[PDB]
Amino acid sequence: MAFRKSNVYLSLVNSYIIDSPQPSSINYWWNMGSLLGLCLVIQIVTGIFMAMHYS
Amino acid sequence: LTVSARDAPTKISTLAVKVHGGSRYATKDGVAHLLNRFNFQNTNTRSALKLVRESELLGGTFKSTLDREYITLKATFLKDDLPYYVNALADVLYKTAFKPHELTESVLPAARYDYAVAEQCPVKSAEDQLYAITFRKGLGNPLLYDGVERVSLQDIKDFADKVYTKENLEVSGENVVEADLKRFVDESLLSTLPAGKSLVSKSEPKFFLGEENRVRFIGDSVAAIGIPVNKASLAQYEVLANYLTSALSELSGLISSAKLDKFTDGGLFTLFVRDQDSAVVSSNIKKIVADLKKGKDLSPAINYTKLKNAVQNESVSSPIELNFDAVKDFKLGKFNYVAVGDVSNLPYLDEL
Amino acid sequence: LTVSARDAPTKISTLAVKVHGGSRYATKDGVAHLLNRFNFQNTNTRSALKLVRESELLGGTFKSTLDREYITLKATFLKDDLPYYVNALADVLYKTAFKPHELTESVLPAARYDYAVAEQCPVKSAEDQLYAITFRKGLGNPLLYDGVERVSLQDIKDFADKVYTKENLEVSGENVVEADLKRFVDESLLSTLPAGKSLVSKSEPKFFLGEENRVRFIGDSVAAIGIPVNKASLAQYEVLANYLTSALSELSGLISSAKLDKFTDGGLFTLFVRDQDSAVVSSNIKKIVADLKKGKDLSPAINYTKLKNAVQNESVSSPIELNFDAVKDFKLGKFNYVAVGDVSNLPYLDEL
Amino acid sequence: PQSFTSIARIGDYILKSPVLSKLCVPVANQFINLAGYKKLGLKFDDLIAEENPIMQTALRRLPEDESYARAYRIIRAHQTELTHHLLPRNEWIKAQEDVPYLLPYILEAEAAAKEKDELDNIEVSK
Amino acid sequence: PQSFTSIARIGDYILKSPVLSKLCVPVANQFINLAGYKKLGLKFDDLIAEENPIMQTALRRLPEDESYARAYRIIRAHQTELTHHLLPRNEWIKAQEDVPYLLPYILEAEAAAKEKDELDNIEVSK
Amino acid sequence: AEVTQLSNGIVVATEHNPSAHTASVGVVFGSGAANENPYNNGVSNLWKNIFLSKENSAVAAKEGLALSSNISRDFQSYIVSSLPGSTDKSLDFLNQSFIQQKANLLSSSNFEATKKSVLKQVQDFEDNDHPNRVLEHLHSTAFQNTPLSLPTRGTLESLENLVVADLESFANNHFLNSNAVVVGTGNIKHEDLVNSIESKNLSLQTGTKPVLKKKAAFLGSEVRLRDDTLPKAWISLAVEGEPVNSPNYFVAKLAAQIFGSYNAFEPASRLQGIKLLDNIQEYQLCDNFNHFSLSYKDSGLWGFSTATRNVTMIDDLIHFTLKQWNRLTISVTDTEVERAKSLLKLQLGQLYESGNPVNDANLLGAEVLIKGSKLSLGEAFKKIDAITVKDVKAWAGKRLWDQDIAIAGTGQIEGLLDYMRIRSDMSMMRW
Numbered sequence A: 001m002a003f004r005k006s007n008v009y010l011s012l013v014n015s016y017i018i019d020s021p022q023p024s025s026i027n028y029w030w031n032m033g034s035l036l037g038l039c040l041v042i043q044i045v046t047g048i049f050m051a052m053h054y055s
Numbered sequence B, C: 001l002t003v004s005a006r007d008a009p010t011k012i013s014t015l016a017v018k019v020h021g022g023s024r025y026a027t028k029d030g031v032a033h034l035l036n037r038f039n040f041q042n043t044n045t046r047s048a049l050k051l052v053r054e055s056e057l058l059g060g061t062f063k064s065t066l067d068r069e070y071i072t073l074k075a076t077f078l079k080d081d082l083p084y085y086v087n088a089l090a091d092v093l094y095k096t097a098f099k100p101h102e103l104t105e106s107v108l109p110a111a112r113y114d115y116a117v118a119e120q121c122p123v124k125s126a127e128d129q130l131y132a133i134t135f136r137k138g139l140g141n142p143l144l145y146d147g148v149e150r151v152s153l154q155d156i157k158d159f160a161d162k163v164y165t166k167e168n169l170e171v172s173g174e175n176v177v178e179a180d181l182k183r184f185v186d187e188s189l190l191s192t193l194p195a196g197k198s199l200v201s202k203s204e205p206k207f208f209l210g211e212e213n214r215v216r217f218i219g220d221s222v223a224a225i226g227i228p229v230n231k232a233s234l235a236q237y238e239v240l241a242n243y244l245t246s247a248l249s250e251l252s253g254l255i256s257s258a259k260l261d262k263f264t265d266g267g268l269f270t271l272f273v274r275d276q277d278s279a280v281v282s283s284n285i286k287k288i289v290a291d292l293k294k295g296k297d298l299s300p301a302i303n304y305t306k307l308k309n310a311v312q313n314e315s316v317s318s319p320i321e322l323n324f325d326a327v328k329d330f331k332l333g334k335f336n337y338v339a340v341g342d343v344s345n346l347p348y349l350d351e352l
Numbered sequence D, E: 001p002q003s004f005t006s007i008a009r010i011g012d013y014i015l016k017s018p019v020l021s022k023l024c025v026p027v028a029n030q031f032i033n034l035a036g037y038k039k040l041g042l043k044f045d046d047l048i049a050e051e052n053p054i055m056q057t058a059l060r061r062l063p064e065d066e067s068y069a070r071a072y073r074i075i076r077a078h079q080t081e082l083t084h085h086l087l088p089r090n091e092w093i094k095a096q097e098d099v100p101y102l103l104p105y106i107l108e109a110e111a112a113a114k115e116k117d118e119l120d121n122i123e124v125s126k
Numbered sequence F: 001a002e003v004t005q006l007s008n009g010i011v012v013a014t015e016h017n018p019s020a021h022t023a024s025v026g027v028v029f030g031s032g033a034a035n036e037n038p039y040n041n042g043v044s045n046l047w048k049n050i051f052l053s054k055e056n057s058a059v060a061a062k063e064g065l066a067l068s069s070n071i072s073r074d075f076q077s078y079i080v081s082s083l084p085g086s087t088d089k090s091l092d093f094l095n096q097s098f099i100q101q102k103a104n105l106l107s108s109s110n111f112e113a114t115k116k117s118v119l120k121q122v123q124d125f126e127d128n129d130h131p132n133r134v135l136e137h138l139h140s141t142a143f144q145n146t147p148l149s150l151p152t153r154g155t156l157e158s159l160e161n162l163v164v165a166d167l168e169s170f171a172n173n174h175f176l177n178s179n180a181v182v183v184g185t186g187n188i189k190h191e192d193l194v195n196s197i198e199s200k201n202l203s204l205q206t207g208t209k210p211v212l213k214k215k216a217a218f219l220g221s222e223v224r225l226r227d228d229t230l231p232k233a234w235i236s237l238a239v240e241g242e243p244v245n246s247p248n249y250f251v252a253k254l255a256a257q258i259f260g261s262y263n264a265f266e267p268a269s270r271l272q273g274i275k276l277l278d279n280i281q282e283y284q285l286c287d288n289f290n291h292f293s294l295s296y297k298d299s300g301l302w303g304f305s306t307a308t309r310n311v312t313m314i315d316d317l318i319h320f321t322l323k324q325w326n327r328l329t330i331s332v333t334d335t336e337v338e339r340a341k342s343l344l345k346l347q348l349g350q351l352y353e354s355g356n357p358v359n360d361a362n363l364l365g366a367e368v369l370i371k372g373s374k375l376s377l378g379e380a381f382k383k384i385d386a387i388t389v390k391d392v393k394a395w396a397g398k399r400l401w402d403q404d405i406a407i408a409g410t411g412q413i414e415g416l417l418d419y420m421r422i423r424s425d426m427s428m429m430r431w
């Protein structure tokens, strides 16, 4: 088998982001959870960086 | 549409619907097997789940049995409930749903498994080899299904229309009261069954003698003979098999199996010598075929044989009872042969 | 320890080591099959990986072939390298490692698969049925292994000591220079091989006639005959099979297969009629057996038959060449029979 | 999970009453048009949600070539749906086609289930 | 992963030299005692770490009843080890027993591997 | 001794073998199943099968003749085989069949018994011969709407639409002399045939050329015949290969040679010195494969073909393989190349030097048509060996790396992935 499938870590990466079998027909509505994870990451980065100067 | 019932002061009543549609009457290879294994399925008004469910609550169970001659739709219950299981068997005979799915998910499956336990017993492997080379297309039919001949669901249904007829069945009964049976039999769908005609063979069957066939098998090694005995030769091979299987015949420990079947127009005397060693088959068949041809006074086993056929019979329907006392000597004339297991190291007929 | 080699101005040399240890010479059921499939394994000084690895680099390949008579250890290469593959074949014959593991992981496996493709071709299923009922224990041996007889690794080794002898092989060669072969043959381990004796049969084989056996098979339906022809009857059935397989015989489109084998002391004339429909077997065998007994003037196919045996032969070792011109008429006297597929709906010999 | 056995009850009733039937069916007809679905080659029995046992008793049971049929439509559906289009007008399932091919089995199985439910909790009076 | 083929080289040499052999083996003997392991029914070939291909070529190959043997010891080991005890003195593997039952195959396989390694990178001079 | 080639109107070619027991004569029409059209497909395989219908084959069966026939894509052949002495017995029976007789084989009882058997023929093929079926469709999609696409044995569609008026429509256009070559193989001389040929008069439709079509072309595409009822999965894949008489004809056959051909059952196969094999075998990713560089007059197909009972892991199968193919451009071992050159030769041999005249015919007939002459084995080998690694690293560098592919298949190919995956594995990420 391929490495990304075999590795303990990259297998998740593959199976949730690379090799995941999606319905062929889904539209831009479904792009929301993706864009959801992106905000949560924007929240956490900028938050921490700000906390460094917050009282 | 015969009807008997031997009453008694017991707790467990029984029943049956002895039909004439075993292998011998099979349209295609093992269509009885698909029909034996379609019984007590869903009727058109009763569900096999409900049939099973209710039965336990009343305390009784059903069982479709197959053999070369019968498809005995027996039941078994507590006494006070006879008409239920009576109408039950009847209702199965007339109107079993015979749905496409009931086949693929319950009939064909259940059929496959029977043949599975078959392919791991060589004595039986050959007891179908006897019949199919001796009697041939008649009683020499494949007992259980094997997919070699594509029995569709249509072919299972025709065979149900065929064998399920008034002039082709025989109700039995044990611890049943005969009048009660006849009445409930008549008030049941049984009497409404298209009477048709019988298939029971009164005219004796065409047979063969000296025929041989061999099988490539992975398992124990077994060799087997087949004898087209008569309506007369019946009680002879009965006092023979019971002697060969007893402590009188010195060679009961050289034959693994030996018995005579009983039809209403024939029989078959098969002797099976089976063992792992492909030797012991050559060593206990070169002798067995000899000792018999030499001559066997079967008479000392006439006190035995009777006992071993007055305990064997418990079905209210039997063959020729009194025929025993007129036996004496035996001599093996002609015979058929099937060898199973290690073929390149098992006897041939030409040396037997 | 014969040695020939027909040179030519070509690029690809070839080779062989035609041995006498096919089925006919098999100790137990298919021990040639385990030995055919043990060749070009590891020797005691050479590894089958290295044997394969090096060969490609030199540009040549090896192939152990089995049949009823041979275990032909042929090679095939570019010319300038003959001694390599020469000593190779030799080195296999003398000292193949025959390790326990090489069996379980490469021999038994590879053996199992051959039989797999076998069990899905009924023509072959029956062509082992012919031999094993006609000739019996001799050439009527199981061609490929089948586990019914437990051939241990010991039994594979004895058979290697047996069939691998000077007086039991015949080196061949095509685009090889004969002197080069004889020299390298002599300088090879070949000459050091225990000479022993031959097993080649000059005295003709005990046969049988009128024997029949049938098989329960799921697949196409096929029926097959078997004829113990002579060292004389050779060229007769050759102009017969080539007529039956040609546009002259009107019934070439009623027979799926027909050909005659050639041994140095016999042959076998098998005709296969195969089809899905269990009918077409009853319909093209009730006729075929007739049209031949009626009489077939095989002579118009004597211009054909020669051509179809001067192209068939390409092995420098053949049987009786000039024997053709003395043929005329044919009539089917006695014969053996095997029926495969739907047995309850395929002909019997008694109606053939 | 409103039951098919239950939709049968209601929708049979309405179909029978010549009173009701004349009122309802015009609309129902108008409805199964506005749905859009026969324009994606879809028969209505295609649409029925499957992720539940009954439908998986009901598709295991559905005749072979019938399932190959379903299949092609379901893929044709997705394919087109993703092309953000509607089929060539003459590829649409026609009003006579939209037949309840599945509904017997669904009903066949529903029945069977409700029966077993009952027969698991069947009580006793002595 | 110091190689067995390599332990062979070194340990054979030492075994051969009557010089070396007399110096070393006393200690080595003293060592394979202080280990404690023959007191948990363990032969030394039991101890060899298996999670690698060679040993799995070497256990697939190891004669049946031989593996049943290994097995019992390995379980006997664990069992006892967990009882925080040593075996009944007369259950211990005895000095003649601790035989390299596995080592041929390990060597057999090591050999085979190094060969293939070579034959994968075999170059050519023209 | 070097193959003979002389023309007196009829281009007569022969090739002698002094150790042959038999010989063969026949014609090769330089127009095959790729000179046909969309709705006359299989006309060339229909012509072959009347030629072997019991009628004409019973004639030559008293005479001691055997007939051989085959249709390719660029070419089309009609061969007869017999003993070397009955060499006039061949030439005459050929003459009868192709200038004398016309409607003796073209009966309404013949032709409706051949077409009612080339219909059962092409209905066991597309029914049960998946590996070629897959292989055939591969052309259909790679060379879609272009000459090579038409399956050689023709569609069951354009094969029930064809009467005798159509067998001829192709005959009288493409069954000429200026499109044919007569061959002599096996055990006969050049001065035996070209003598017995100038012995006979007449001329059929002289001056006539056969016609032409739009030259073939290639385009990256798929076609997928999923069938989840078939126990295995068959796949064939390729790029725009190399034609016959292309500068890299041999360079490309050497590449194919490297990865080669597998059979997971024959223990011999398991040991081949093929790098790819290291991967595939771990989990048994397949039952077999094999490569190729199919060359045709106008275009070619370099790729490979595989069958597999391993359905969940096909996605690796195609992956390991197409990655290997990348090495051919960036990292092929020289010592791999030699094992190629070496093995090519052995294969290219049993091709050209088989002891069977009928093969040496089509081989000759086709080649002496396209380039005029044949090329000798020593000529071929002298080329194979010249080939460096740089030979293979610049051929893959144009032909293989990041180029459109052409997949086709059937069986359990749900696992066979999509086109933007597969195609993407033509390259590797670089800095």
Ligand code: HEM
Pocket (backbone or CB within 6 Å): A040, A043, A044, A045, A046, A047, A048, A049, A050, A051, A054
């Ligand atoms: C789900 C993730 C988060 C959400 C929804 C969220 C929401 C908010 C909102 C609404 C405010 C007030 C913003 C304004 O009006 O100024 C705020 C402020 C703040 N947040 Fe977060 N927050 C998140 C994560 C974080 C994290 C991970 C940190 C890490 C330290 C963080 C640190 C801060 C700080 C220091 C402030 C005050 C400065 C400011 O208001 O901009 N936040 N947050």
Ligand SMILES: COc1c(O)c(C)c(C/C=C(\C)CC/C=C(\C)CC/C=C(\C)CC/C=C(\C)CC/C=C(\C)CCC=C(C)C)c(O)c1OC
Pocket (backbone or CB within 6 Å): A016, A017, A020, A022, A026, A030, A031, A033, A034, A036, A037, A038, A040, A041, A044, A045, A048
């Ligand atoms: C089934 O269908 C799917 C589908 O499965 C997926 C996965 C996607 C793709 C969607 C995703 C990949 C969404 C995934 C969402 C997440 C992974 C969100 C998780 C995010 C976190 C858990 C945040 C954690 C973040 C940190 C630890 C960063 C903090 C580190 C910092 C701040 C370091 C900086 C500090 C210093 C001092 C430098 C689809 O589009 C989709 O539709 C077809």
